[PDB]
Short mmCIF file of all heavy atoms in Angstrom, two decimals:
data_model
loop_
_atom_site.label_atom_id
_atom_site.label_comp_id
_atom_site.label_asym_id
_atom_site.label_seq_id
_atom_site.Cartn_x
_atom_site.Cartn_y
_atom_site.Cartn_z
N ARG T 1 124.56 73.22 85.25
CA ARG T 1 123.91 73.45 83.96
C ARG T 1 122.84 74.52 84.05
O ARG T 1 122.61 75.25 83.07
CB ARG T 1 123.32 72.15 83.43
CG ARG T 1 124.36 71.08 83.13
CD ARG T 1 123.69 69.80 82.66
NE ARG T 1 122.83 69.23 83.68
CZ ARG T 1 122.00 68.22 83.48
NH1 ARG T 1 121.89 67.63 82.30
NH2 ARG T 1 121.25 67.78 84.49
N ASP T 2 122.16 74.63 85.19
CA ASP T 2 121.10 75.62 85.39
C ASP T 2 121.58 76.80 86.24
O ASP T 2 120.76 77.53 86.80
CB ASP T 2 119.88 74.96 86.03
CG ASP T 2 119.26 73.90 85.14
OD1 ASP T 2 119.38 74.01 83.91
OD2 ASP T 2 118.66 72.95 85.69
N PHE T 3 122.89 76.98 86.35
CA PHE T 3 123.44 78.03 87.20
C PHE T 3 123.10 79.42 86.67
O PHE T 3 122.67 80.29 87.44
CB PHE T 3 124.96 77.85 87.32
CG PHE T 3 125.63 78.91 88.15
CD1 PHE T 3 125.51 78.91 89.53
CD2 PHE T 3 126.38 79.90 87.55
CE1 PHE T 3 126.12 79.87 90.29
CE2 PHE T 3 127.00 80.87 88.31
CZ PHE T 3 126.87 80.86 89.68
N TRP T 4 123.29 79.65 85.37
CA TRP T 4 123.11 80.98 84.81
C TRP T 4 121.65 81.34 84.58
O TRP T 4 121.35 82.52 84.36
CB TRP T 4 123.88 81.11 83.50
CG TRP T 4 125.36 81.15 83.71
CD1 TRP T 4 126.25 80.14 83.49
CD2 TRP T 4 126.13 82.27 84.17
NE1 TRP T 4 127.52 80.56 83.79
CE2 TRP T 4 127.47 81.86 84.21
CE3 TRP T 4 125.81 83.58 84.55
CZ2 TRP T 4 128.50 82.71 84.62
CZ3 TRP T 4 126.82 84.42 84.96
CH2 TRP T 4 128.16 83.98 84.99
N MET T 5 120.73 80.37 84.63
CA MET T 5 119.30 80.66 84.49
C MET T 5 118.67 80.91 85.86
O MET T 5 117.74 80.23 86.29
CB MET T 5 118.61 79.53 83.75
CG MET T 5 119.04 79.39 82.30
SD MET T 5 118.15 78.08 81.43
CE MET T 5 118.92 76.63 82.13
N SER T 6 119.21 81.91 86.55
CA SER T 6 118.76 82.29 87.87
C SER T 6 117.84 83.50 87.80
O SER T 6 118.00 84.36 86.93
CB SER T 6 119.95 82.61 88.79
OG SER T 6 120.78 81.48 88.97
N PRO T 7 116.86 83.60 88.70
CA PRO T 7 115.98 84.78 88.72
C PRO T 7 116.65 86.04 89.23
O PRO T 7 115.98 87.07 89.33
CB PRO T 7 114.86 84.34 89.67
CG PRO T 7 115.51 83.37 90.59
CD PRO T 7 116.51 82.63 89.75
N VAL T 8 117.94 85.99 89.54
CA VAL T 8 118.66 87.13 90.08
C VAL T 8 119.58 87.75 89.03
O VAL T 8 119.60 88.97 88.86
CB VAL T 8 119.45 86.73 91.34
CG1 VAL T 8 120.19 87.92 91.92
CG2 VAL T 8 118.50 86.14 92.37
N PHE T 9 120.34 86.92 88.31
CA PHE T 9 121.11 87.44 87.18
C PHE T 9 120.22 88.02 86.10
O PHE T 9 120.62 88.98 85.43
CB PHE T 9 121.99 86.34 86.57
CG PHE T 9 123.27 86.11 87.32
CD1 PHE T 9 123.40 85.04 88.19
CD2 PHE T 9 124.36 86.95 87.13
CE1 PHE T 9 124.58 84.82 88.87
CE2 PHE T 9 125.54 86.73 87.82
CZ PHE T 9 125.65 85.67 88.68
N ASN T 10 119.02 87.48 85.91
CA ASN T 10 118.10 87.91 84.86
C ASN T 10 117.03 88.79 85.50
O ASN T 10 116.05 88.29 86.05
CB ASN T 10 117.49 86.70 84.15
CG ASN T 10 118.51 85.92 83.34
OD1 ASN T 10 119.37 86.50 82.68
ND2 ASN T 10 118.41 84.59 83.38
N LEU T 11 117.23 90.11 85.42
CA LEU T 11 116.35 91.08 86.05
C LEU T 11 115.65 91.94 85.00
O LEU T 11 116.28 92.40 84.05
CB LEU T 11 117.12 92.00 87.01
CG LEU T 11 117.64 91.35 88.29
CD1 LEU T 11 118.53 92.32 89.05
CD2 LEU T 11 116.48 90.89 89.16
N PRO T 12 114.35 92.17 85.16
CA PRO T 12 113.64 93.07 84.24
C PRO T 12 113.99 94.52 84.52
O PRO T 12 114.68 94.86 85.49
CB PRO T 12 112.16 92.78 84.52
CG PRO T 12 112.15 92.31 85.94
CD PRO T 12 113.45 91.57 86.16
N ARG T 13 113.48 95.40 83.66
CA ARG T 13 113.78 96.83 83.79
C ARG T 13 113.07 97.45 84.99
O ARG T 13 113.50 98.49 85.49
CB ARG T 13 113.40 97.56 82.51
CG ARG T 13 113.89 99.00 82.44
CD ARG T 13 113.47 99.67 81.15
NE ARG T 13 112.02 99.66 80.97
CZ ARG T 13 111.19 100.51 81.54
NH1 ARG T 13 111.62 101.47 82.34
NH2 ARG T 13 109.89 100.41 81.30
N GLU T 14 111.99 96.82 85.47
CA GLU T 14 111.24 97.34 86.61
C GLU T 14 110.82 96.16 87.48
O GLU T 14 110.05 95.30 87.03
CB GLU T 14 110.03 98.15 86.15
CG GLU T 14 110.38 99.47 85.49
CD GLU T 14 109.15 100.23 85.00
OE1 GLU T 14 108.04 99.67 85.08
OE2 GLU T 14 109.31 101.38 84.54
N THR T 15 111.31 96.13 88.72
CA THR T 15 110.97 95.08 89.66
C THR T 15 110.04 95.62 90.75
O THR T 15 109.86 96.83 90.90
CB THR T 15 112.24 94.49 90.28
OG1 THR T 15 112.92 95.49 91.03
CG2 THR T 15 113.16 93.96 89.18
N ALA T 16 109.45 94.71 91.52
CA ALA T 16 108.51 95.10 92.56
C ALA T 16 109.20 95.52 93.86
O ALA T 16 108.54 96.12 94.72
CB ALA T 16 107.54 93.95 92.85
N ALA T 17 110.49 95.24 94.00
CA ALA T 17 111.21 95.67 95.20
C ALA T 17 111.20 97.19 95.32
O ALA T 17 111.05 97.72 96.43
CB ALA T 17 112.65 95.15 95.18
N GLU T 18 111.37 97.89 94.21
CA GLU T 18 111.27 99.34 94.23
C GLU T 18 109.84 99.80 94.49
O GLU T 18 109.63 100.82 95.16
CB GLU T 18 111.77 99.90 92.91
CG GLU T 18 111.95 101.38 92.94
CD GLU T 18 110.68 102.15 92.66
OE1 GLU T 18 109.71 101.57 92.14
OE2 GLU T 18 110.71 103.38 92.85
N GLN T 19 108.86 99.10 93.92
CA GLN T 19 107.47 99.45 94.16
C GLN T 19 107.13 99.37 95.64
O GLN T 19 106.35 100.19 96.15
CB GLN T 19 106.54 98.54 93.36
CG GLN T 19 106.68 98.68 91.86
CD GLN T 19 105.72 97.78 91.10
OE1 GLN T 19 104.98 97.01 91.71
NE2 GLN T 19 105.74 97.88 89.78
N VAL T 20 107.72 98.41 96.35
CA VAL T 20 107.55 98.33 97.80
C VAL T 20 108.07 99.60 98.46
O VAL T 20 107.42 100.17 99.34
CB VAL T 20 108.26 97.08 98.36
CG1 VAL T 20 108.21 97.09 99.88
CG2 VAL T 20 107.64 95.83 97.80
N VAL T 21 109.25 100.06 98.04
CA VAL T 21 109.86 101.23 98.66
C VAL T 21 109.02 102.48 98.40
O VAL T 21 108.88 103.34 99.28
CB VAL T 21 111.31 101.40 98.17
CG1 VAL T 21 112.02 102.50 98.94
CG2 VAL T 21 112.07 100.09 98.29
N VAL T 22 108.46 102.61 97.20
CA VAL T 22 107.59 103.75 96.90
C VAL T 22 106.31 103.69 97.71
O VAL T 22 105.87 104.69 98.30
CB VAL T 22 107.29 103.84 95.40
CG1 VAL T 22 106.20 104.86 95.13
CG2 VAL T 22 108.53 104.24 94.66
N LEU T 23 105.67 102.52 97.74
CA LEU T 23 104.36 102.40 98.37
C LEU T 23 104.45 102.56 99.89
O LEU T 23 103.57 103.18 100.50
CB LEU T 23 103.74 101.06 97.97
CG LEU T 23 102.55 100.42 98.67
CD1 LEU T 23 101.38 101.38 98.76
CD2 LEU T 23 102.15 99.21 97.85
N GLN T 24 105.51 102.03 100.50
CA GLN T 24 105.71 102.24 101.93
C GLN T 24 105.90 103.72 102.25
O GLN T 24 105.33 104.23 103.23
CB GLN T 24 106.91 101.43 102.42
CG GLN T 24 107.14 101.46 103.92
CD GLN T 24 106.10 100.65 104.68
OE1 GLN T 24 105.73 99.56 104.26
NE2 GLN T 24 105.64 101.19 105.80
N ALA T 25 106.69 104.43 101.44
CA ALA T 25 106.89 105.86 101.65
C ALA T 25 105.58 106.64 101.49
O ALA T 25 105.32 107.56 102.26
CB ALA T 25 107.95 106.39 100.69
N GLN T 26 104.77 106.27 100.50
CA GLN T 26 103.48 106.94 100.32
C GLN T 26 102.56 106.69 101.51
O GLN T 26 101.86 107.61 101.97
CB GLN T 26 102.83 106.48 99.02
CG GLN T 26 103.57 106.94 97.77
CD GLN T 26 102.88 106.50 96.50
OE1 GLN T 26 101.87 105.79 96.53
NE2 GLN T 26 103.43 106.91 95.36
N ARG T 27 102.55 105.46 102.03
CA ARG T 27 101.73 105.16 103.20
C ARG T 27 102.20 105.96 104.42
O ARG T 27 101.38 106.50 105.16
CB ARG T 27 101.77 103.66 103.49
CG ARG T 27 100.87 103.22 104.63
CD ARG T 27 100.85 101.70 104.76
NE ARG T 27 99.97 101.25 105.83
CZ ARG T 27 100.36 101.00 107.07
NH1 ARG T 27 101.62 101.13 107.44
NH2 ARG T 27 99.46 100.59 107.97
N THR T 28 103.52 106.04 104.63
CA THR T 28 104.04 106.84 105.73
C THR T 28 103.75 108.32 105.56
O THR T 28 103.57 109.03 106.56
CB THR T 28 105.54 106.61 105.90
OG1 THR T 28 106.22 106.94 104.69
CG2 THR T 28 105.82 105.16 106.26
N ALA T 29 103.73 108.82 104.32
CA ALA T 29 103.35 110.21 104.08
C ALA T 29 101.89 110.45 104.44
O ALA T 29 101.55 111.44 105.10
CB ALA T 29 103.62 110.58 102.62
N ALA T 30 101.01 109.54 104.00
CA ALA T 30 99.61 109.63 104.38
C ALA T 30 99.41 109.56 105.88
O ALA T 30 98.51 110.23 106.40
CB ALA T 30 98.81 108.52 103.70
N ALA T 31 100.23 108.79 106.59
CA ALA T 31 100.10 108.71 108.04
C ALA T 31 100.31 110.07 108.71
O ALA T 31 99.53 110.45 109.59
CB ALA T 31 101.10 107.69 108.60
N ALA T 32 101.34 110.81 108.31
CA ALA T 32 101.58 112.13 108.89
C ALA T 32 100.57 113.16 108.41
O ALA T 32 100.18 114.06 109.16
CB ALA T 32 103.00 112.60 108.59
N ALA T 33 100.15 113.05 107.14
CA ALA T 33 99.07 113.91 106.67
C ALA T 33 97.80 113.70 107.48
O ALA T 33 97.04 114.66 107.68
CB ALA T 33 98.79 113.64 105.19
N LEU T 34 97.55 112.48 107.96
CA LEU T 34 96.39 112.24 108.80
C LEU T 34 96.46 113.03 110.11
O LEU T 34 95.46 113.62 110.53
CB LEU T 34 96.25 110.74 109.10
CG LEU T 34 95.70 109.90 107.95
CD1 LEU T 34 95.73 108.43 108.32
CD2 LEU T 34 94.29 110.34 107.60
N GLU T 35 97.62 113.05 110.76
CA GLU T 35 97.77 113.85 111.97
C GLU T 35 97.66 115.34 111.70
O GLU T 35 97.06 116.07 112.50
CB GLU T 35 99.10 113.54 112.66
CG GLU T 35 99.15 112.18 113.33
CD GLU T 35 100.46 111.94 114.06
OE1 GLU T 35 101.37 112.78 113.92
OE2 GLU T 35 100.57 110.92 114.77
N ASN T 36 98.23 115.81 110.58
CA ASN T 36 98.06 117.22 110.22
C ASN T 36 96.59 117.57 110.03
O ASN T 36 96.11 118.59 110.55
CB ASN T 36 98.86 117.54 108.96
CG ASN T 36 100.33 117.74 109.23
OD1 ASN T 36 100.72 118.33 110.24
ND2 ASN T 36 101.17 117.24 108.33
N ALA T 37 95.85 116.72 109.32
CA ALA T 37 94.42 116.94 109.13
C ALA T 37 93.65 116.86 110.43
O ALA T 37 92.68 117.60 110.62
CB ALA T 37 93.87 115.93 108.13
N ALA T 38 94.04 115.96 111.34
CA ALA T 38 93.37 115.87 112.63
C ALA T 38 93.57 117.14 113.44
O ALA T 38 92.63 117.65 114.06
CB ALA T 38 93.88 114.65 113.40
N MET T 39 94.80 117.67 113.45
CA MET T 39 95.00 118.90 114.21
C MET T 39 94.33 120.08 113.53
O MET T 39 93.99 121.05 114.20
CB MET T 39 96.48 119.20 114.42
CG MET T 39 97.21 118.18 115.27
SD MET T 39 98.89 118.73 115.46
CE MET T 39 99.36 118.35 113.78
N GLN T 40 94.15 120.01 112.21
CA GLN T 40 93.37 121.03 111.51
C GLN T 40 91.89 120.96 111.89
O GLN T 40 91.26 121.99 112.14
CB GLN T 40 93.53 120.88 110.00
CG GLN T 40 92.66 121.84 109.19
CD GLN T 40 93.02 123.29 109.41
OE1 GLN T 40 94.20 123.65 109.43
NE2 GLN T 40 92.01 124.13 109.59
N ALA T 41 91.32 119.76 111.92
CA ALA T 41 89.89 119.56 112.09
C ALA T 41 89.46 119.48 113.55
O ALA T 41 88.26 119.40 113.82
CB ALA T 41 89.44 118.29 111.36
N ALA T 42 90.40 119.49 114.49
CA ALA T 42 90.03 119.50 115.90
C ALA T 42 89.28 120.76 116.32
O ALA T 42 88.68 120.78 117.40
CB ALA T 42 91.27 119.32 116.78
N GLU T 43 89.30 121.81 115.50
CA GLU T 43 88.65 123.07 115.83
C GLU T 43 87.17 123.10 115.47
O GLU T 43 86.48 124.07 115.81
CB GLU T 43 89.36 124.23 115.14
CG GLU T 43 90.79 124.46 115.59
CD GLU T 43 91.43 125.64 114.89
OE1 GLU T 43 90.79 126.22 113.99
OE2 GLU T 43 92.58 125.98 115.23
N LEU T 44 86.66 122.08 114.78
CA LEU T 44 85.25 122.07 114.41
C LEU T 44 84.31 122.13 115.61
O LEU T 44 83.35 122.92 115.57
CB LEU T 44 84.94 120.85 113.52
CG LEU T 44 85.54 120.86 112.11
CD1 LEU T 44 85.19 119.57 111.38
CD2 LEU T 44 85.07 122.07 111.33
N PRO T 45 84.50 121.35 116.68
CA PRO T 45 83.68 121.57 117.88
C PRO T 45 83.96 122.89 118.57
O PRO T 45 83.12 123.36 119.34
CB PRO T 45 84.05 120.38 118.79
CG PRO T 45 85.40 119.98 118.33
CD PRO T 45 85.40 120.19 116.85
N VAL T 46 85.11 123.51 118.31
CA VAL T 46 85.47 124.76 118.97
C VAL T 46 84.85 125.95 118.25
O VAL T 46 84.35 126.89 118.88
CB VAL T 46 87.00 124.89 119.07
CG1 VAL T 46 87.38 126.22 119.69
CG2 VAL T 46 87.57 123.73 119.88
N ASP T 47 84.88 125.93 116.91
CA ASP T 47 84.38 127.06 116.13
C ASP T 47 82.87 127.26 116.27
O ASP T 47 82.39 128.37 116.05
CB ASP T 47 84.73 126.87 114.66
CG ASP T 47 86.22 126.88 114.41
OD1 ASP T 47 86.95 127.55 115.18
OD2 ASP T 47 86.67 126.22 113.45
N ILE T 48 82.13 126.21 116.64
CA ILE T 48 80.68 126.31 116.71
C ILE T 48 80.21 126.97 118.01
O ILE T 48 79.21 127.68 118.01
CB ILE T 48 80.06 124.91 116.54
CG1 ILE T 48 80.45 124.33 115.17
CG2 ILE T 48 78.55 124.97 116.67
CD1 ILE T 48 80.10 122.86 115.01
#
């Protein structure tokens, strides 16, 4: 009787599973940007 009232058959237009995929990718992008910035800023003790 409660078979069709499942949280899987009834899906909204925007779920959080996709938000996880976006946010993980953004975090991984920031991780590599951190290394790029570190190799950029390693010259501050050198330039002086």
Side-chain angles (χ1 to χ4, degrees):
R1 296 178 297 171
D2 297 332
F3 178 74
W4 289 103
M5 294 182 286
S6 297
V8 181
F9 279 101
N10 292 320
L11 290 172
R13 190 180 58 81
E14 291 178 354
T15 64
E18 191 276 344
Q19 296 181 357
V20 174
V21 188
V22 170
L23 165 53
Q24 186 72 41
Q26 293 181 357
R27 185 174 181 266
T28 58
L34 284 175
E35 288 183 352
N36 281 321
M39 295 183 288
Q40 176 64 44
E43 296 181 356
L44 291 178
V46 177
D47 296 331
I48 300 169

